[PDB]
Design a protein around this ligand. Sequence first.
Ligand SMILES: O=C1C=CC(=NNc2ccccc2C(=O)O)C=C1
Ligand SMILES: O=C1C=CC(=NNc2ccccc2C(=O)O)C=C1
Ligand SMILES: O=C1C=CC(=NNc2ccccc2C(=O)O)C=C1
Ligand SMILES: O=C1C=CC(=NNc2ccccc2C(=O)O)C=C1
Ligand SMILES: *[C@@H]1O[C@H](CO)[C@@H](O)[C@H](O)[C@H]1NC(C)=O
Ligand SMILES: *[C@@H]1O[C@H](CO)[C@@H](O)[C@H](O)[C@H]1NC(C)=O
Ligand SMILES: *[C@@H]1O[C@H](CO)[C@@H](O)[C@H](O)[C@H]1NC(C)=O
Ligand SMILES: *[C@@H]1O[C@H](CO)[C@@H](O)[C@H](O)[C@H]1NC(C)=O
Lengths: 121, 121, 121, 121
Amino acid sequence: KCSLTGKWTNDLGSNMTIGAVNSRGEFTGTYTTAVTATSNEIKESPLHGTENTINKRTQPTFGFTVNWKFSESTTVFTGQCFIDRNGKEVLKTMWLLRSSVNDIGDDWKATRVGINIFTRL
Amino acid sequence: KCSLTGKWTNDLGSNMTIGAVNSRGEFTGTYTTAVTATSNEIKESPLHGTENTINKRTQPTFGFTVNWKFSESTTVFTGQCFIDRNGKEVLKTMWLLRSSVNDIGDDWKATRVGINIFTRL
Amino acid sequence: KCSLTGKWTNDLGSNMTIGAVNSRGEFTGTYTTAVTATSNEIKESPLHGTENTINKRTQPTFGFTVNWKFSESTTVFTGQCFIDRNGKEVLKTMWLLRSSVNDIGDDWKATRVGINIFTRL
Amino acid sequence: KCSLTGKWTNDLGSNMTIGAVNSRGEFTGTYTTAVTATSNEIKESPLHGTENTINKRTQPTFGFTVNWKFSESTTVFTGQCFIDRNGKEVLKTMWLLRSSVNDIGDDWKATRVGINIFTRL
Ligand SMILES: O=C1C=CC(=NNc2ccccc2C(=O)O)C=C1
Ligand SMILES: O=C1C=CC(=NNc2ccccc2C(=O)O)C=C1
Ligand SMILES: O=C1C=CC(=NNc2ccccc2C(=O)O)C=C1
Ligand SMILES: O=C1C=CC(=NNc2ccccc2C(=O)O)C=C1
Ligand SMILES: *[C@@H]1O[C@H](CO)[C@@H](O)[C@H](O)[C@H]1NC(C)=O
Ligand SMILES: *[C@@H]1O[C@H](CO)[C@@H](O)[C@H](O)[C@H]1NC(C)=O
Ligand SMILES: *[C@@H]1O[C@H](CO)[C@@H](O)[C@H](O)[C@H]1NC(C)=O
Ligand SMILES: *[C@@H]1O[C@H](CO)[C@@H](O)[C@H](O)[C@H]1NC(C)=O
């Protein structure tokens, strides 16, 4: 049983906390990013997502959206919860980071991509 | 003012419907995909997402997750709502489609990527 | 028979020219990008790539690298040559644009992604 | 001075060997993948690429194409050569793996994406 509910930290030092997952797979959380110039104001942003219920799975796929505070951007993450090495949980994700452009001719360059591995904190 | 609420169709023939967007940017919807072997059972899946409120924008960025029915997979979409040509709305998105693997050594191959352009239906 | 050799232009207005493809699938070319601030100096960059020979195909897959002039960046493209509508050739590609960072802690953000459709010029 | 010439192995167990890089940044090599069902026939495929010369760099960006044997597919990799921890070289890459489809209506699903970290062997 690989469960998203809990405290996680990514290979970049960002922390997220994901709350309860309901009957329909939905969850909510907060994301505290490690990626910005130091603000005395704590950079928290909400997140919302769903995990796949088809078949229970116990290593389900999932997705979620972060709507960044103090930024026009959105990141989406998707991945799967794995469980191994006497029970250590890992989320393997890939993401897209969408920036905002003000002219559709710059759309082509508005999207970044990479990976994040999240482990229990 | 570029608004996600409404009926959209993608370059593949999939239809989605997105409901009201609340004060915190959240929305819900359904996704009817054009991509599967014909089921007499209508393939609808929910979606959940958020759009970026920072600054009103009127061409905001956004993300959402689709949790596919009759499949172990999840797609995440992210993009921006544009408005042009005497007022025609377009969503330019990129997506990741995560499949489910049963062994972490196949993780590397579980993620697809592409684009979708969504126009009003 | 879908052939890469020739003159192509992308949905952004960039032009490329690809030369002969040899027995081992290799080719060379030039890329004239539409994407930069107007230089009186013509922005041409070489490209090098290969296409897949396994089975002849006539709609083969392929990849190539552009090593951008006056920039520290590299783009890689990959795709397939299609042929349709009384014989119109199209290259459907996706790309990654790698920027240069000077500190490995910014690596995560150095890669962009999108699509390009190339048609005969 | 971070140099691509040499022997590398990836987080999946694949080995590649990259030869000399010339004045124009070009190189050639072989790729021995860890990713297939065991063939008594050694799975080697050529690769061809370029690295960015603008400014010498010593941590340049680069790209290359692998044209897979016994497969219709092509992978493209792009990244940057880093150097750290008393001199340990690392290539951080992202890739696209293009499969072959026989009908352009399946194009949307033909491309995978992920990362590879390559270290000296
Ligand atoms: O103002 C901003 C804009 C974008 C951001 N992206 N963060 C990410 C994007 C992709 C993957 C991980 C992260 C992270 O912060 O951990 C953070 C703050
Ligand atoms: O059983 C499944 C599994 C995956 C699916 N992906 N659909 C998509 C994935 C990416 C972009 C567009 C679509 C779409 O259906 O329009 C659909 C049904
Ligand atoms: O100085 C630079 C840096 C990056 C560039 N990327 N061009 C591209 C990247 C991806 C897809 C298409 C293009 C293009 O120019 O058509 C061009 C000039
Ligand atoms: O027949 C095939 C088809 C595709 C392959 N892709 N390999 C890869 C694709 C992306 C990243 C790393 C690898 C690898 O083999 O290390 C290998 C053999
Ligand atoms: C995340 O939490 C850990 C442990 O509480 C802490 O060391 C780290 O500074 C936190 N990171 C951020 C970005 O808040
Ligand atoms: C989407 O809606 C349009 C118009 O109602 C219709 O022609 C099309 O068949 C629908 N597609 C799907 C996949 O339901
Ligand atoms: C590409 O070629 C076409 C036709 O020759 C021309 O109109 C266009 O300006 C060229 N674009 C660039 C960026 O050189
Ligand atoms: C790569 O080389 C190492 C060391 O020579 C070896 O252990 C490994 O089996 C090789 N892998 C492949 C896929 O050839």
